């Protein structure tokens, strides 16, 4: 498949805030959720991701949170 998405600055899944960039998926920017959701079982062994940093589109100003 080719005709589809081009490359949003946010997660290619939710499009809220991408914090990772999959090289195996054509540099597809993913988040810490959608990614660890599916990109945690497949042959990710090759899908080398990187700490992508967009134009602070949907960034946050707080420390660590749980819950
Ligand atoms: Zn996402
Ligand atoms: Zn991938």
Domain limits, the chain: 1-67
Q: For residue 27, how far is its CA from the centre of ligand 2 (angstroms)?
A: 8
Which distant-in-sequence residues (6+ apart) come within 8 Å of 34 by Cβ? 11, 13, 14
- Let me know how many helices (H) and strands (E) the chain has, helices first: 1, 3
Strand partners, 29: 21
Alpha-helix residue ranges (DSSP H) falling in 1-67: 34-38
| CA of 34, nearest ligand number | 1
Q: For residue 24, how far is its CA from the centre of ligand 2 (angstroms)?
A: 5
Indicate which technique resolved this structure: NMR
Residue 18, CB half-sphere, CA atoms under 13 Å: how many? Answer: 22
Token couple for 24: 């195996």
Which distant-in-sequence residues (6+ apart) come within 8 Å of 67 by Cβ? none
SS3 36: helix
Question: Cα(3)–Cα(1) distance, rounded to whole angstroms?
Answer: 6
CA 6 to chain centre: 14
Strand partners, 49: 22
């Amino acid at each position: 498949g080719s005709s589809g998405s081009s490359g949003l600055p946010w997660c290619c899944i939710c499009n809220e805030d991408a914090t990772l960039r999959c090289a195996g998926c054509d540099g597809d920017l993913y988040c810490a959720r959608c990614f660890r959701e599916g990109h945690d079982n497949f042959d990710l062994k090759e899908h080398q991701t990187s700490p992508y940093h967009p134009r602070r589109p949907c960034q946050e100003h707080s420390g660590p949170s749980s819950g």
